[PDB]
RNA sequence: CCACCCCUCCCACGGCGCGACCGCUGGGGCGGACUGUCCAGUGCGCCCCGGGCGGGUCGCGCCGUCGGGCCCGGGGGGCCA
């Protein structure tokens, strides 16, 4: 009788990011700086 | 028409210090993610700037030059005029 497809109307999206963004070079380069500081004050406090 | 004496036009090229324009670019603040075996650190989206730098566009001031304009225009020597 009526095979034609009435589409579902695209509601206004508030646009929030459920996905985690890609970690930038500055952050990645700085983490390994913080880690190699954290390791050397885990010796200076220790020894 | 040119050598002589001031001034004046646009165009060309080079220099120079200035305006008005896309990038680049430390710090002040919203907003959110994120990191570190101390509370401390790092991008990020709207904007704000304290700045400088050239790229070229665009528009100036002034200087350069046996400059180009039938050597623009106005106050003795050579022209297949």
UniProtKB/Swiss-Prot annotation:
Modification type Phosphoserine: residues: 24
Start-end of Basic residues biased regions: 10-20
Subcellular location per the Swiss-Prot or TrEMBL entry: Cytoplasm; Nucleus, Nucleolus
Domain of life: Eukaryota
Disordered: annotated span: 5-47
Complex formation: Component of the large ribosomal subunit (LSU). Part of the 5S RNP complex, which is a LSU subcomplex composed of the 5S RNA, RPL5 and RPL11. Component of a hexameric 5S RNP precursor complex, composed of 5S RNA, RRS1, RPF2/BXDC1, RPL5, RPL11 and HEATR3; this complex acts as a precursor for ribosome assembly. Interacts with isoform 1 of NVL in an ATP-dependent manner. Interacts with RRP1B. Interacts with IPO5, IPO7 and KPNB1; these interactions may be involved in RPL5 nuclear import for the assembly of ribosomal subunits.
Function: Component of the ribosome, a large ribonucleoprotein complex responsible for the synthesis of proteins in the cell. The small ribosomal subunit (SSU) binds messenger RNAs (mRNAs) and translates the encoded message by selecting cognate aminoacyl-transfer RNA (tRNA) molecules. The large subunit (LSU) contains the ribosomal catalytic site termed the peptidyl transferase center (PTC), which catalyzes the formation of peptide bonds, thereby polymerizing the amino acids delivered by tRNAs into a polypeptide chain.
Family: Belongs to the universal ribosomal protein uL18 family.
Protein name: Large ribosomal subunit protein uL18
Organism: Oryctolagus cuniculus
Classification lineage: Eukaryota, Metazoa, Chordata, Craniata, Vertebrata
Gene this protein is translated from: RPL5
């Amino acid at each position: 009788e009526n095979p034609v497809y009435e589409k579902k109307p695209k509601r206004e999206v508030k646009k929030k990011r459920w996905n985690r963004p890609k970690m930038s070079l500055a952050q990645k380069k700085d983490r390994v700086a913080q880690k190699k500081a954290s390791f050397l004050r885990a010796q200076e406090r220790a020894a």
